RNA sequence: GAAAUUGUUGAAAGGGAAGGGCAUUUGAUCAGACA
RNA sequence: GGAAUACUGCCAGCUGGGACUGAGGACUGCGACGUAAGUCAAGGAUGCUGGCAUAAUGGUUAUAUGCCGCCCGUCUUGAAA
RNA sequence: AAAUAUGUAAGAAGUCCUUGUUACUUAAUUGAACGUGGACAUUUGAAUGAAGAGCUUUUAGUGGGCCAUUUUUGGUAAGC
C-alpha cells in the first residue's frame, strides 16, 4: 500500500537484577500499524537475542515528511534474497517524499529484478545534498539546466465507443 | 458443527404404551395434580404409572410390613403403584391404611381382616391432594429372571 | 518404584489454604484463595534520561 | 413477535437506557475539552526528527 | 493387510471414559494379612458404636 | 372484586423507583469512560514533557469472530474452536485475555481473526445482534426486566451494566459473558479488503491478529 | 373390448437425434366469484 | 510565532432517493410527550382512490427462445463406458 | 539433547483436632486401617466449555477399500 514511516522503540524486559535493558530503536517502512511492529521484531531479532515473548514495543511514532513539496535526490541502499544467494545493490531515485521513493523501490525491484515484498532489506535511505556526485546516469539527465522537452503523440481517451472525427494526436 | 448428536429424543415416557382406558384417567388426573399443587410428591407417582409391567414388580405385604416397623412412621399411608400380593409368611399385621392400583384376593382379606382399609388412586389423591403423610414403596428388581445377562466371570 | 513430587507440591499448598483463612477469619478481610493466569501487564512511565535510544539500520550485508 | 432494532426506532430505545434522553441534551458526545499547550521536551524530538 | 486408518475416529464416538472410582475399593487382591485382621477390626468398632454410643 | 386500578397504580410506580436506578447510575459510567480516556491522553502528554515514554498497559478483552467454514479441520483445532462456542461461520464471541486463554487462540490462529473492541462496537453488538440465553433457547433481549431476572443476583440489572462488565472487565465477566448466546454475523458489507483471506494479516489476508481494525470490520458485519 | 401396434381426419413442430428442469411470450382450453 | 486542512476515530447529529416483506388478530406488557384528560412511530398495516367484472389475472397443455441436462438396473476402490 | 506427541495432580470420598476398635504390628496402645465427636462453606481452592449426566439390554449392516500433504522402508524408476 501506501508505505508510512514508523519509529518503533524495543526494551527487553525489566527484570531483578537488571533493571533498565538499554534500548533500541528503527525505523520501519509499512503499511500500517500492524505491520510494523511486527516486522521489527523480524530484523531486531537477527542483531541481538530478544524475542517477541521475551521483549515489548515502546512506543510507535508516525514520522511525517520534514519538506514534502521540495524535490529530493534519494540514494537507497538494497540487500535482497534472489534465487541465488543474496547480495547488496545501491539504487537512486528522484522523488518527492522519504516514504514515496520506497514506494517507487519496491516497483523497481519487482519490474526489473523480480523481488518480491519479503525478499527485500531496505538498509538506509539517504539524501543525497549537493548535485554532482550522483553515481547513476539516469538520475542525472535531468539535472540540466533549463531542462525542456515535449510530450510527443498524445493519446486521447474516448468515452463513447464511435467517433465521427477521424481523431488525430498532438 | 454439532457438539451433541442430532435431533434426540428424551428416552423415557410421556404417555403409557397401555390402551387401558380406566388407566388413562388416573394419568389424566395426575398430569392435573402435578401441573398444579407443586409438591415433588406427585411427579414421583406420575413417573410411576408409565412404567411396564416388568418395571412395576408386585409388592409382597410382608414388604410393606417391614415399611412400619420404621421408627416415626406408624400411621403413613403406603402408596404402592404396582399390585399388592399376599404372603402367608408373616403372622400379625398392622392397621395401616394402603394405597394400590391392584390388590389380590388374599393381600385384599389380610389387610381387611386386620382392620385397615384398603384404597385406590383416586381416593388417594381426594384424601391426600399434595401427597402428605404418604410413603412409596417400589418392588425389587434384580429378583426377576436377570440372572443371565452375560458375562465370561460372573 | 518411583516416588512422586507434584503431589507432594499441593499437599503443602493446602496448609498455606488453611493459614490465610485462619487468618483472614481473625481480621476480617477478603481471602483471594484461588490462584490464577497470568495477567497483562499495567501502565509505566519510562524515562529515558539515564539511556539515549539508538538506532540500528539493519545493513549488515 | 418482532425484533425491534435499537439506534433507529428511537422509542425503543428510550425503552432501554433512560440517559439517552439527557445525552441529547447536554449533546456529550460533539464535547470540546479544556486545551492545555504543554510543549514536548528536547530529547524526544530530536530522535524523532532525526535519527 | 494391516493399517489402523480410521481407528481412532472409531474411539472418540463414545468418548473414553475412567472406570469411575467408587468408594470402598475392593479388597480381593489386597494382602490376607491384612484382610484377616481387618475383619475382626470392623466387628468390634460396629458393637462400641451400638452399645456405648446411644 | 378489587385490583381493579389499585395494583396497576402502585405497580406502574414501582417501576419509577427501579428506572431510577438505572439513570443515575448510567450517569457514572459516563463520567468513568470519559475520565477514562482523558487520563491515558494526558499521560502521554505529561511524558513528552517530562521527556520520558509512557507505554500503554496491554489490552485484557479480545474479540474473535470465526472465519473458515465447518469442514476439514483437524482434531486440535475442531476442540478447540468448540470451547469458545464458535460453531459456524461469521460467530464471535469475548474473550478474556490471561496466559490460558492467549494459547487457545495461538492454535486456532488459521481460522480466526481478533483484535481489541472499543466501546462502540461493543454497544452496537448487544443493542442490535444481542441474544439471551434463558433456562434455554436464546431468547432476545428487547427489555432490562429480562436481564434483571436472570443476572439479579451477580449486581447487573440493566443493558448498559452488562457492556459495563465486558468492558471494563469485573469479578462477574465469566457469568455475564455466558449469559450471552454467541454472536451472529452477516458477511460484511463493504468486503474483506483483500482478494485472497487465508493468508495472515500482516502478509494481507485476514486471519490473525490484527489489534484495532476489528472494529472496522465488525461494524460492516453488524 | 385395455396397452403395444396401426389407418383416416384435425392441430402443431422440424438445417446431423429425440425426450427433460427452471422462467416467460404466443396459441388452444377451462374452473372459481361478483346479488 | 500563529493557524488551516488532509489522515484516523466518535456521535443515544440532521435529512433526501430506491428495493423486499404486512407474518399476528378483543384487552393485559414495557414505555415517550403532556398540567391533565389523553394522544403517540410504544408486544407485527392501515387510510384514501381508480379500472374491470371477464378469459383480464390465473390454472393446464402445445410450441418458441435464454441457460442447464451423457441411460437406466447391478457388481465395484471406480460406470456415460 | 530440542520441537511435535505423552502419564498424573489442581480438595468434601478434603484438611485439622479430640480419641474408639482388633486376633495384624510395635520394646511400648507405638503404628496401620476404618470410625464416633468438634471446628472448616459458595473465591470449596487454575482457564474455557458442558444443546442433561449416568447405567442397562437388544439386535442390523460391515470384516475386497482407495486418494492427497508430510515423515519413511523395499525398488533405478513409476498412477510400483
Redesign the pocket.
Given at each position: 500500500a501506501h508505505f508510512k514511516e514508523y519509529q518503533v522503540i524495543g526494551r527487553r524486559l525489566p527484570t531483578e537484577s537488571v533493571p533498565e535493558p538499554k534500548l533500541f530503536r528503527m525505523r520501519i517502512f509499512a503499511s500500517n500499524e500492524v505491520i510494523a511492529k511486527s516486522r521489527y521484531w523480524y530484523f531486531l531479532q537477527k542483531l541481538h537475542k530478544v524475542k517477541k515473548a521475551s521483549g515489548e514495543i515502546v512506543s510507535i511514532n508516525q514520522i511525517?515528511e520534514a519538506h514534502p513539496t521540495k524535490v529530493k535526490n534519494f540514494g537507497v541502499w538494497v540487500r535482497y534474497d534472489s534465487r541465488s544467494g543474496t547480495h547488496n545493490m545501491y539504487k537512486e531515485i528522484r522523488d518527492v517524499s522519504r516514504v514515496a521513493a520506497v514506494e517507487t523501490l519496491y516497483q523497481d525491484m519487482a519490474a526489473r529484478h523480480r523481488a518480491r515484498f519479503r525478499s527485500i532489506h531496505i538498509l538506509k535511505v539517504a539524501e543525497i545534498e549537493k548535485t554532482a556526485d550522483v553515481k547513476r546516469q539516469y538520475v542525472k539527465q535531468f539535472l540540466t539546466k533549463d531542462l525542456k522537452f515535449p510530450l510527443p503523440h498524445r493519446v486521447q481517451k474516448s468515452t463513447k465507443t464511435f467517433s465521427y472525427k477521424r481523431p488525430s494526436t498532438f | 458443527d454439532?457438539?451433541?448428536?442430532?435431533?434426540?429424543r428424551?428416552?423415557?415416557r410421556t404417555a403409557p404404551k397401555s390402551d387401558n382406558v380406566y388407566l388413562k384417567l388416573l394419568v389424566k388426573l395426575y398430569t392435573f395434580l402435578a401441573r398444579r399443587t407443586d409438591a415433588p410428591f406427585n411427579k414421583v407417582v406420575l413417573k410411576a404409572l408409565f412404567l411396564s409391567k416388568i418395571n412395576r414388580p408386585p409388592v409382597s405385604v410382608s414388604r410393606i410390613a417391614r415399611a412400619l416397623k420404621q421408627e416415626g412412621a406408624a400411621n403413613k399411608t403406603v402408596v404402592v403403584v404396582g399390585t399388592v400380593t399376599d404372603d402367608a409368611r408373616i403372622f400379625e399385621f398392622p392397621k395401616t391404611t394402603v394405597a394400590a392400583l391392584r390388590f389380590t384376593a388374599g393381600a385384599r382379606a389380610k389387610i381387611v381382616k386386620a382392620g385397615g382399609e384398603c384404597i385406590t388412586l383416586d381416593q388417594l389423591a381426594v384424601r391426600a391432594p399434595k401427597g402428605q403423610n404418604t410413603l412409596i414403596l417400589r418392588g425389587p428388581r434384580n429378583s426377576r429372571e436377570?440372572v443371565?445377562?452375560?458375562?465370561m466371570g460372573p | 518404584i518411583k516416588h512422586?513430587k507434584?503431589?507432594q507440591?499441593?499437599?503443602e499448598?493446602?496448609?498455606?489454604?488453611?493459614a490465610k483463612?485462619?487468618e483472614a477469619?481473625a481480621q476480617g478481610v477478603?481471602?483471594?484463595?484461588?490462584?490464577?493466569?497470568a495477567q497483562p501487564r499495567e501502565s509505566r512511565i519510562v524515562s529515558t534520561e539515564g539511556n539515549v535510544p539508538q538506532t540500528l539500520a539493519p545493513v549488515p550485508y | 413477535?418482532?425484533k425491534?432494532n435499537?439506534?433507529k426506532?428511537?422509542?425503543?430505545?428510550?425503552?432501554?437506557?433512560?440517559?439517552?434522553?439527557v445525552?441529547?441534551?447536554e449533546?456529550?458526545?460533539?464535547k470540546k475539552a479544556e486545551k492545555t499547550?504543554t510543549?514536548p521536551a528536547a530529547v524526544f524530538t530530536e530522535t524523532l526528527k532525526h535519527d | 493387510?494391516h493399517?489402523a486408518?480410521?481407528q481412532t475416529r472409531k474411539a472418540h464416538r463414545n468418548?473414553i471414559?475412567?472406570p469411575?472410582?467408587?468408594?470402598?475399593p475392593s479388597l480381593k487382591g489386597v494382602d490376607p494379612?491384612?484382610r484377616?485382621?481387618?475383619?475382626?477390626?470392623?466387628?468390634?468398632?460396629?458393637?462400641?458404636?451400638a452399645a456405648?454410643?446411644k | 372484586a378489587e385490583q381493579v386500578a389499585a395494583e396497576?397504580a402502585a405497580?406502574?410506580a414501582a417501576?419509577?423507583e427501579?428506572?431510577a436506578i438505572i439513570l443515575e447510575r448510567?450517569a457514572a459510567?459516563?463520567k468513568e469512560?470519559e475520565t477514562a480516556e482523558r487520563n491515558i491522553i494526558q499521560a502521554k502528554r505529561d511524558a513528552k514533557a517530562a521527556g520520558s515514554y509512557y507505554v500503554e498497559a496491554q489490552h485484557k478483552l479480545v474479540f474473535v469472530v470465526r472465519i473458515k467454514g465447518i469442514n476439514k479441520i483437524p482434531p486440535?483445532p475442531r476442540k478447540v474452536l468448540?470451547?469458545?462456542?464458535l460453531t459456524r461461520i461469521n460467530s464471535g464471541?469475548f474473550?478474556?485475555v490471561?496466559k490460558?486463554?492467549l494459547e487457545?487462540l495461538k492454535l486456532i490462529e488459521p481460522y480466526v481473526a481478533y483484535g481489541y473492541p472499543?466501546?462502540?462496537?461493543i454497544?452496537?453488538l448487544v443493542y442490535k445482534r444481542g441474544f439471551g440465553?434463558i433456562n434455554?433457547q436464546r431468547v432476545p433481549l428487547?427489555?432490562?426486566?429480562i436481564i434483571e431476572a436472570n443476572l439479579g443476583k451477580y449486581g447487573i440489572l440493566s443493558i448498559?451494566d452488562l457492556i459495563h462488565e465486558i468492558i471494563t472487565v469485573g469479578?462477574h465477566?465469566?457469568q455475564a459473558?455466558?449469559f450471552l448466546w454467541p454472536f451472529k454475523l452477516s458477511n460484511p458489507s463493504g468486503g474483506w479488503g483483500v482478494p485472497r483471506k487465508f493468508k495472515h494479516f500482516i502478509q494481507g489476508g485476514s486471519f490473525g491478529n490484527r489489534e484495532?481494525?476489528i472494529?472496522?470490520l465488525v461494524?460492516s458485519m453488524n
Open positions: 511525517n | 454439532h457438539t451433541s448428536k442430532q435431533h434426540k428424551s428416552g423415557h436377570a443371565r445377562h452375560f458375562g | 512422586s507434584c503431589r507440591e499441593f499437599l499448598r493446602v496448609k498455606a489454604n488453611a483463612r485462619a477469619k477478603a481471602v483471594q484463595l484461588k490462584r490464577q493466569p | 413477535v418482532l425491534k435499537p439506534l426506532n428511537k422509542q425503543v430505545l428510550l425503552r432501554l437506557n433512560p440517559y439517552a434522553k445525552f441529547a441534551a449533546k456529550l458526545g460533539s499547550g510543549k | 493387510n493399517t486408518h480410521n468418548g471414559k475412567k469411575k472410582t467408587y468408594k470402598y494379612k491384612f484377616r485382621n481387618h475383619k475382626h477390626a470392623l466387628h468390634g468398632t460396629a458393637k462400641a458404636l456405648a454410643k | 396497576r405497580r406502574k417501576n419509577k427501579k428506572r448510567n459510567y459516563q469512560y486440535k468448540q470451547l469458545l462456542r464471541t474473550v478474556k490471561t490460558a486463554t487457545l472499543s466501546y462502540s462496537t454497544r452496537q440465553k434455554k428487547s427489555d432490562n426486566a448498559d469479578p465477566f465469566k459473558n455466558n484495532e481494525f472494529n472496522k461494524k
